[PDB]
Amino acid sequence: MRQTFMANESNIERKWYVIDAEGQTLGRLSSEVASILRGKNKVTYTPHVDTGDYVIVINASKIEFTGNKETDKVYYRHSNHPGGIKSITAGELRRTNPERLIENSIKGMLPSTRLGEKQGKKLFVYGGAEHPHAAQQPENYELRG
Amino acid sequence: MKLHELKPAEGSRKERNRVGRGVATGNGKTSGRGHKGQKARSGGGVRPG
Amino acid sequence: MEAKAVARTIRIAPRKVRLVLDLIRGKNAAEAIAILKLTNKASSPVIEKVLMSALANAEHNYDMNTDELVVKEAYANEGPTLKRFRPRAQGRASAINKRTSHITIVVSDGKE
Amino acid sequence: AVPKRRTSKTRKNKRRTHFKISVPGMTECPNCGEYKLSHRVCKNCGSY
Amino acid sequence: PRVKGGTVTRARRKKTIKLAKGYFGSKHTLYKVAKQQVMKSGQYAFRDRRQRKRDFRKLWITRINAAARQHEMSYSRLMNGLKKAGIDINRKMLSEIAISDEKAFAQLVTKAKDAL
Amino acid sequence: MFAIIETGGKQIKVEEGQEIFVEKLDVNEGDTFTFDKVLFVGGDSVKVGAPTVEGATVTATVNKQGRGKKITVFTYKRRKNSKRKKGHRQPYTKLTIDKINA
RNA sequence: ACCGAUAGUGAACAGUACCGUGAGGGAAAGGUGAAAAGCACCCCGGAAGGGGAGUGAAAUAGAACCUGAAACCGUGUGCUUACAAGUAGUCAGAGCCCGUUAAUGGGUGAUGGCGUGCCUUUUGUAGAAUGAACCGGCGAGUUACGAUUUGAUGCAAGGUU
RNA sequence: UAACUUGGGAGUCAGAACAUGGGUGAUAAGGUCCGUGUUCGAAAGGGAAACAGCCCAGACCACCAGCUAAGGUCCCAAAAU
RNA sequence: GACAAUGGUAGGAGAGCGUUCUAAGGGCGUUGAAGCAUGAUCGUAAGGACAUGUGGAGCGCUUAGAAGUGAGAAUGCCGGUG
Ligand SMILES: [Mg+2]
């Protein structure tokens, strides 16, 4: 007897959250956020529809590293031109454009499908303590760890 | 017996094997001959003795 | 109602006829006659004669008013091919296909 | 030099997307006669 | 007497053609490629009737895990406790309950907690 | 209202007046069957089976002993000359739940 | 208990087209209808072709004439597609459109999982090893006479011509 | 729970990697020649990213049931942040 | 009924499906045979029906017999078409 609930687009209700990346470790914040961008923390989780919530990371210039990672955590970016390999350390990438640091770390934990691409478009990283989306009325989340 | 109800004695008749007629018979492609050599050729046996 | 006309075994290739025939599909008859007089492909006069024949059938056999008629369908089918040869270098021959076409036009007034 | 694979129906028909001809200019001969090609003269079959 | 091939070849080939309805391009038109594709699809169907049973069990466990974290348990300990309590409900039923009836699932969780 | 029964080699969640399909049973059309393995009763008063609820039957009427849609089982090995093909229709029985006796 | 138009003669209409200086080699090509009753006359068109009218049981039987498959070429539409990386399917699955040899129906497919054609030959082939453009027809353990072994049947110290 | 004897019918005589006892080579080779096991050949399924020969295991057919092996439990990706 | 077995290449053994023809029996057909086309049908497989359209004169079924008895591959042969 086949009786398993599947979610539709007329079933799903996505809500908004705010994470504070202040005094947190990159990666350890990123995996917990990645699990929320997908509906993994929900019953009614269905794998062929998008059933996750929106996230906002606010401070994101206060993120932390543990080792000597800030001087040798190069990133490496090729450009498809002969000898066109480029480079930047993790330390200088959070000094300039800290938003691309966290965004890229979280998107690397999502599947590379047509649905993973759409799920990663709910991220909204900012540097500093304020964000524009007051009209969506987001709550705080308080990472589990 | 009637001429429309003939039956042979049980065990007396039998159908002949036809070789080289598809894979499910068990005697399809190579027809029971194995692979290459003198014995797989047409008229290929060696002399008795 | 509908009136049709066919021209069978025209000695132009169908790929060349269809190219002009895609210009008049779904237009009223007067505009289609105008278009066929100003296009300068080889198949314009032949298609024009087929269209004229259909318009005359629509009026003599079915008593339709030719002032309000549209070209409902226009298409070209393949006919039988004539097979020929051309001598090439070093004693070799190559094939040549002289292709033909069947051309059909049907006009209607849009009512019943 | 020679094609490695044959060309399917769908690829052949995609290539012929732009292979078409367009409708001509076609202004109308006002005083007398039917349509003519624009900027042209039709001494017969047209007053213009 | 002579037996000419007649009408058996066409009928046999047309069955396989009809089994390839909906395939792309010449894979629904020509006998040779159609036959190859129908063979491959029979092999795929055999293999997938057995992967279905792994996929759905994997989905139920995800849903139960999500439902148990809302009562401060993980799937691991919840199943351990339910076994020590003697409860024998499927993973498939345990996740339909958690979806439709939240109070019943809460009562299951309390018994699983008391058996530890 | 809500009951979990165990039939065949599996478990089903049922309610009053619902149709279900199970592995073949030994009954005739029109008869009445009684499921006596009940693991959980929900709704207003929740009763959780030890595994079993100790009482708690569910009664149902039988409709249509039948056999399912035709499956074709086909497999083959690549360059060996080996394949086989066979069909299968799985039998089932259909019932309508008429009373949940908690 | 021979063939039935790729068969049977090479040849159902030919030692002819055609090829070769010559000796010589050597094809393809059957079927309107019971009866020609084989489309008077009108219309568009230089004609060819066509639309009506008529003959006929039937003209999508009109001489390229019984039936009329597939490859291949078009016209019209129900569902779908312009941020996407593919052996083209398969399993899961919304939405939209329909309604059958009536049964836990049919068409399409947003999105997710898994997934390197077939044959031959090899220790081992997705193989950058071989073969096939596609569709149709044709195309490979047979028969005679001996030998041996097994099953069946008749008679039996005999059996058989 | 096999073995042997008599008769009918075969195919095979290009083998490969891994572990271990040895020759040859240079205590070289995905080398080559023997002894002893296993797997491939002729074996799908799970693991080793992918990966005939390594580790776990031998597919009669249904199922949207359950327990385990090797290997695993932050996210990709099932299970201990 | 209890118990057990059921991956497989060279290869051995068994049981069957379908095609053309013959014999005997029993049938169908201008109120429409064979062939062809479509369908959501039946059987463990090879395969068998039924309904509708086209077609216009032949064809199944049962038991037995006899074979030019089954094609996807041969840089296969012939024709047609890309
Ligand atoms: Mg086309």
Locate tokens 């012929």: which residue? D16
Locate tokens 């309390």: which residue? E110
Q: Are strands A54-57 and A16-19 parallel, antiparallel or unpaired?
A: parallel
Other Cβ atoms within 10 Å of A4 Cβ, number: 13
Return d(Cα A74, Cα A90) in angstroms, integer. Answer: 6
Q: Which of D27, D23, D24, D28 is nearest to D38 (CA)?
A: D27
Q: Tell the burial category of A48 from Cβ atoms under 10 Å away from its Cβ (0-12, 13-18, 19+).
A: exposed
Residue of chain F whose alpha carbon sits nearest to that of B30: F81
CA distances to A74, A85, A91, A132 from A98, in Å: 15, 22, 10, 18
What are the boundaries of each domain within chain E?
Answer: 1-116
Position E34, amino acid: A
Asked whether at least 3 C-beta pairs link E and A within 8 Å, the reply is yes
Q: Alpha-carbon dihedral of residues E18, E21, E26, E31, nearest 10 degrees?
A: -20
**CB of D24 less than 8 A from some CB of C:** yes
- Chain H nucleotides covered by protein, CB below 7 Å: 10-13, 42-43, 45, 59, 61-66, 73-81
Method by which the model was determined: cryo-EM
Q: Which of A56, E64, A2 is nearest to F92 (CA)?
A: A2
Is residue F88 a contact partner of residue F66, using CB atoms and an 8 Å limit?
A: no
Number of structural domains chain F divides into: 1
Supply C54's token pair. 């259909």
Interchain pair F11, E89: CB under 8 A: yes
The conformational region for residue A97 under phi > 0 = left, psi -120 to 50 = alpha, else beta, is: left
Sequence-separated (6 or more) residues with CB below 8 Å from residue A80: none
CA atoms lying within 13 Å on the CB side of residue C56: 8
CA distances to F2, F20, F68, F98 from F95, in Å: 17, 6, 15, 9
Q: Which of C10, C103, C98 is nearest to C50 (CA)?
A: C103
DSSP, collapsed to helix, strand or coil, labels residue E49 as helix
- Chain I nucleotides covered by protein, CB below 7 Å: 8-16, 18-21, 23-25, 35-39, 42-48, 62-72, 81-82
Locate tokens 């007396």: which residue? B12
Supply F88's token pair. 């299968």
Locate tokens 């009951």: which residue? F3
What are the boundaries of each domain within chain D?
Answer: 2-48
* Residue E61 CB in 7 A reach of strand H: yes
* Residue A35 CB in 7 A reach of strand H: yes
Supply C22's token pair. 């895609």
Supply E34's token pair. 């159609």
Number of structural domains chain A divides into: 1
Express the helix, strand and coil content of chain C in percent, nearest 5 each: 35, 35, 30
Supply B34's token pair. 């194995």
CA distances to B10, C7, C15, C52, E31 from C100, in Å: 69, 11, 10, 21, 30
What is the radius of gyration, based on Cα positions, of chain F?
A: 19
F3-31 b/e with 16+ CB inside 10 Å = b? bbbbbeeebbbbeeeeebebeebeeeeee
Return d(Cα E66, Cα E94) in angstroms, integer. Answer: 12
Is residue A21 a contact partner of residue A63, using CB atoms and an 8 Å limit?
A: yes
Provide the resolution (angstroms).
Answer: 2.5
Domain boundaries, position F93: 1-102
Sequence-separated (6 or more) residues with CB below 8 Å from residue B34: B40
What are the boundaries of each domain within chain C?
Answer: 1-112
Q: How far is the CA of E31 from the C1' of G9 (A)?
A: 38
Return d(Cα C64, Cα F20) in angstroms, integer. Answer: 65
Supply A52's token pair. 């996750």
